[PDB]
Amino acid sequence: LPPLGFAIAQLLGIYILAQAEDSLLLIDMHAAAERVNYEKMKRQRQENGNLQSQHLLIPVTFAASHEECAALADHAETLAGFGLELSDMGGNTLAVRAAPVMLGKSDVVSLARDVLGELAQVGASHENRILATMSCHGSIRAGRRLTLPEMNALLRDMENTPRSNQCNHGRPTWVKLTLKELDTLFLR
Amino acid sequence: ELPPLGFAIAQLLGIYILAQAEDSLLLIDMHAAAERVNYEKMKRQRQENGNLQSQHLLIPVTFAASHEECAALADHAETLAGFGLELSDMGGNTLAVRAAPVMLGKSDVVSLARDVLGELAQVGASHENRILATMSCHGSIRAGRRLTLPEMNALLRDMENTPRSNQCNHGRPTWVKLTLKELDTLF
C-alpha cells in the first residue's frame, strides 16, 4: 500500500508517526504541511493567475499599524492576487473581508499581518517569499490534536506533492526507519 | 509527573509498543519485555513462596494429549502444582486444565500446559529457570495478538515495577528511548 503508509499516532505535538511496509515513518508535520501548502499555492498562482478567496461570514477586525494600513492602500490588487480581501476602516483598524480557500481560515489576522508584513518590504517576483510565508498558516500548524484521518489526508497530499521531503529551508520532512534499522536500535 | 516509560500511543509492525514519555519517544520490544517481566514475577514468587500461586478456571479447558503428556501428568502432578498448574487425566488421552498461574493471562492455558508438560518429559529441580523461561512466553502479550492502549500501559507499569526489565536473556535492551533533541538530530 501507499509509500508514506498509514498514520498510527502523533507524538510530542510535532510529529506524525506512520507505519509503512516494513517501516516506521516520522513526519515533521508542520514542515510537511507547509510544503504541501506552498506547492498547491505555487501551482494555483501559475494556473489561475490568482489564489481563490472566500467571503468571510463574520469579517474579523483587528488593530493594524500605520505601516500595515499603508501596505493595504498600496497593494489592494496584489492582496486579491493572493485571495485576501481587506478594508481600512479608520483609527488603524483593518478588516479581513476574504481569505484564501486553501488555508481553511484559522487566525486570519495572523495571516493578514504576515502578508502585509511581506508587502511592506517591497520598496513583483516577491511571489515565492510571500507564498512561503503564507504556507505556514493552514489547518495543520502550531496547534495540534489531529485525528488519524486528518493525518492520513496529509500523507496523501504529500504523496502528491512535487517536493515532499523538503522544507522551505532544505531539511527533510520525514525520516524512515526500516525493520532492520529498528532492530539495530536494540543492539546488545 | 509522568512515569519513566510514559504512555502507550501505538503498536508498530506487530512487534513494538510506541510510548510517549516526557520530551521523548520510547520503543519497547513487546515480546522481550513481557517475557522478562513474566520471568521475574515468577522466579521471585518461586523463591518467596516456594510455589506459583495458581488460579482455578471456571470451566476446565480440555485438550487432546499425547501419551507422553499423559505420562508426564502422572509423574509430576506435584511438581506441576509447584508451577501453578493443575490438570486432570479424564481418559482417552484427553487432559483437562483446572488451574493456571495467576501471573499469566490464560494464554491458551493448553499451550502453556503443553509446553510445561513437554519440559517435564525430559527429567529423571535444577530445571527451574528452564521451566520458568518457557512459561514466561505465555501471558496475555504474545505474538500477533493486537493490544489495546490500556493493555500496553499495564505492561509499561509492570516494567517499571520489575527488576532487570531493561535487559532480555541475551542482555539486549528491552526498550530504547529517543529524546526530542535526538529526534531532531535525525533530521
Residue numbers in the entry:
A (entry chain B): 464 to 586, 592 to 656
B (entry chain A): 463 to 586, 592 to 654
Task: List sentences quoted exactly from the publication behind this structure.
NgoL is the MutL homolog in Neisseria gonorrhoeae- a bacterium that is representative of organisms lacking homologs of MutH. The fact that NgoL harbors a nicking endonuclease activity in its CTD presents a conundrum as to how a homodimeric molecule with two active sites does not create double-strand breaks.
To answer these questions, we have determined the crystal structure of the C-terminal domain of NgoL (NgoL-CTD). The structure has been refined to a resolution of 2.4 Å with a final Rfree and Rcrys of 27.3% and 22.7%, respectively and the quality of the final model was confirmed through a composite omit map. The structure of NgoL-CTD shows the presence of an elongated dimer with dimensions 100 Å by 40 Å. Six leucine residues (L474, L475, L480, L487, L489 and L650) from each monomer are oriented into the interface leading to the formation of highly hydrophobic surfaces that come together to form a very stable dimer. The metal binding motif in NgoL-CTD has the sequence DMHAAAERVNYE, which aligns well with the established consensus sequence of DQHA(X)2E(X)4E, and extends from residues 491 to 502. The motif folds to adopt a helical configuration and is part of the α1 helix.
